[PDB]
Amino acid sequence: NVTTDVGANGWAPTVSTGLGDGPVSASADSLPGRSGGASSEKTKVGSRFSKWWEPAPSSTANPQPSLIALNPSATQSGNASILTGSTAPSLLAYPTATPVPLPNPDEPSQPGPSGDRTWLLDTVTWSQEFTRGWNIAGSNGMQWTGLESLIFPVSTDTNWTSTSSPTAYPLPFSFVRAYPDSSWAAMYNTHSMWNCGWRVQVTVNGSQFHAGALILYMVPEATTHAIQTARDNAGFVFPYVILNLYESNTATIEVPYISPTPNTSSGLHAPWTFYLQVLSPLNPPPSLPTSLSCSIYVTPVDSSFHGLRYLAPQ
């Protein structure tokens, strides 16, 4: 239904000829190897040429009640569990993809239950003074608006200690720094490439008299423009779940693995970044605290590490 040539999704004999030429297209590379790339879904050599020398979440039919009513749910990973007694969002942002053949032949090293588990990433305060689009982060977080000059390697203290409050939680950078002795971080500092998904949950307990909303954002490849648009009205294009005090005391969000390569380089690339920003400023009841405490959790989903060699931290 277009006058232009969108491509035949491959290479055809009639495209390139000595009488006429059309736009050239690339075909799919058929490769053998170990299945990997996609998280939660991953599970004699001879040359083919002769040699010269050789011879529904949101529905009006199912309305979810406010904080008052009993509506319990739970999230489990490894030996960790987080419970709630009221309406709580818990969504995988994107559906898991299909596995792909890996270019490397080495068998992966898996941390298992010791690594893939729900970890207490950070504990932070949420005051009423924070306005719309205010990114909240604590001691384990990092000030990342995209304008900060990151001194390599990211483990340098100046990157995490700033004159103003931190804003982001770069994965796995923030997770590895929070728990450097974990089995996931042990393999992370020993392997050149990794692969896993990420699940972030935040618990904010407020009474039936408290009001306010927080958005749990998972930002892919966080850069200056991307972080600022996530603060704006269009930010909801990115994976999100809102923690509204009217009905919820917690909100969960999970995202599968993403990267230009099937395996991400350790200590040099942050595919996902968590952002806990304010949609509706905290509106606490009179004669009560003007701030509520928040507990941020992080969960690596289906981890695999390739390329074992010496210890090189981030």
């Binding site: 590379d29 058929s30 490769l31 053998p32 190897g33 170990r34 004699k44 050599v45 001879g46 040359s47 083919r48 040429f49 020398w53 050789e54 053949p101 032949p105 080495d106 068998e107």
Partner: protein, 51 residues
């Protein structure tokens, strides 16, 4: 494939004969696979372009 092996295949040959043993040597926890041939290396294709 096995994770460990006490009686593994040795990896020493002889290049003096005139040909290099380009076969991937078997290793534990390693799965060597071949790759499809690109049309870039073929001399009939390579030399068809102007220089």
């Amino acid at each position: 494939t096995l994770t460990e092996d006490l009686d593994a295949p040795q990896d020493t040959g002889n290049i003096e004969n005139g040909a290099a043993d380009n076969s991937p040597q078997p290793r534990t926890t390693f799965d060597y696979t071949g790759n499809p041939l690109p049309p870039d290396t073929k001399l009939e294709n390579f030399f068809s372009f102007y220089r």
